[PDB]
């Protein structure tokens, strides 16, 4: 029952705005102080801002002052974060969290007792980039002497230059699951993504079987099925 569900994340260019939501339930949302904490991909937790039970007291990091505006709606049990003038360094997963205790203990503008963030949401992803939506080019990684060892050949597909994430990959419309190594994407200098997916199969099966990778990229409406086979002369 006690939880926080977030939404409003997405992909936007530098300078644009985004509104995040955090719907609370299982407790009196109007009693507790609420936080926003963000985490850049593969980085530490950075506290963003905090708002009091009644919205009358707010604090935030210097990084986001004048750009981000924390607010809430107690009649609707929702926390908000109006992010304006977004930069590249704002790219992160944004969590909303609740104080452990409803009552705060201040002794001035600079002093509050830290009781800890007891409840956390699952997060919502914000990706700030100047790259435009693009579908992948799918190229075959053909099997060969250099791909084969001990009667087991490797073959795959190169999913190059797409934006944004994510891309799903399968083999033979899901019929081929054993030996599938789909690697996480690499983010290039151009702002475009690339990833590879490889299947280990018997060398004897190559001539009696056709292997097709099924690359799907929903943001660009790109669905490609690429036949992978040995190269000739």
């Amino acid at each position: 029952q006690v939880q926080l569900v977030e939404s409003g994340g997405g992909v936007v260019q530098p300078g644009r705005s985004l509104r995040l939501s955090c719907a609370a339930s299982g407790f009196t949302f109007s009693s507790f102080g609420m936080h926003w904490v963000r985490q850049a991909p593969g980085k530490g937790l950075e506290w963003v801002a905090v708002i009091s039970f009644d919205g009358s007291i707010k604090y935030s990091v210097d990084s986001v002052k004048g750009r981000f505006t924390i607010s809430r709606d107690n009649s609707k049990n929702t926390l908000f974060l109006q992010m304006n003038s977004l930069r590249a360094e704002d790219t992160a997963v944004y969590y909303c969290a609740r104080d452990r205790l409803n009552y705060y203990d201040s002794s001035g503008y600079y002093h509050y007792k830290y009781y800890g963030m007891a409840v956390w949401g699952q997060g919502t992803t914000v990706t700030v980039s100047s790259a435009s939506t693009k579908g992948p080019s799918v190229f075959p990684l053909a099997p060969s002497s250099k791909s084969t060892s001990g009667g087991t050949a490797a073959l795959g597909c190169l999913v190059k230059d797409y934006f944004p994430e994510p891309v799903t990959v399968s083999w033979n419309s899901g019929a081929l699951t054993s030996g599938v190594h789909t690697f996480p994407a690499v983010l290039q200098s151009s702002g475009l993504y690339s990833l590879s997916s490889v299947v280990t199969v018997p060398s004897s099966s190559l001539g009696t079987q056709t292997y097709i990778c099924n690359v799907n990229h929903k943001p660009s409406n790109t669905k490609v099925d690429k036949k992978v086979e040995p190269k000739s002369c």
Partner: protein, 215 residues
């Protein structure tokens, strides 16, 4: 730069105990309560400890907290494989007028033997070369612990331009995978005799090679 200083990584064996330090100043730890947070891979943070040494419901007594002036510690007795996580200490800083976190601490449990990487190097496809691009794909799998260095070469000389390498990522079998890409033009791909992907792991290297004349 963080105000609270944690160690970037720690490690120990299942059954052993380990400590994670968190050092601050009078403006944060010295005059306030500290809380610790566990973040399991691919999940949101969870409150571990509050008010220096208190545990919420559902958190076992293996976890414990200590305080000694400006420093704070998180003790974990009887380690388990499930305790692999990033651990953060946090509090309010009265100078910055802001809630503050430490850099974090990677706890990796000694729960597996050392494993060498399997490397597979693919050359550019004819279809890619026909589109005036060229990408060598080096794929690295089944290595432990999760840390590798990738170096590329062309006729013996190193190449830093065009290299895009990814971080290690945990496979379903608890070993790690990674990949490195080398972007080229068709012209400079054909100009060299051979290219090589050299994957180093625990000081030991595995090399693979491709050439434009091959097929």
């Amino acid at each position: 730069q963080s105000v609270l200083t944690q160690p970037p990584s720690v490690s120990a064996a299942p059954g052993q105990k380990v400590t994670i330090s968190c050092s601050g100043s009078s403006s944060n730890i010295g005059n306030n309560y500290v809380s610790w947070y566990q973040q399991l891979p691919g999940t949101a943070p969870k409150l571990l400890i509050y008010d220096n040494n208190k545990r919420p419901s559902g958190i076992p007594d293996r976890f414990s907290g200590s305080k000694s002036g400006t420093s704070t510690t998180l003790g974990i007795t009887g380690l388990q494989t499930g305790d692999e996580a990033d651990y953060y200490c946090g509090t309010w800083d009265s100078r910055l007028s802001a809630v503050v976190f430490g850099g974090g601490t990677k706890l990796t449990v000694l729960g597996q033997p050392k494993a060498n990487p399997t490397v597979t190097l693919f050359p550019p496809s004819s279809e890619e070369l026909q589109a005036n691009k060229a990408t060598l794909v080096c794929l690295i799998s089944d290595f432990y612990p999760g840390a590798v260095t990738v170096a590329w070469k062309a006729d013996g000389s190193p190449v830093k331009a065009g290299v895009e390498t990814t971080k290690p990522s945990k496979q379903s079998n608890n070993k790690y995978a990674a990949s490195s890409y080398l972007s080229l033009t068709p012209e400079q791909w054909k100009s060299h005799r051979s290219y090589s992907c050299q994957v180093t792991h625990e000081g030991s290297t595995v090399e693979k090679t491709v050439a434009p004349t091959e097929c």
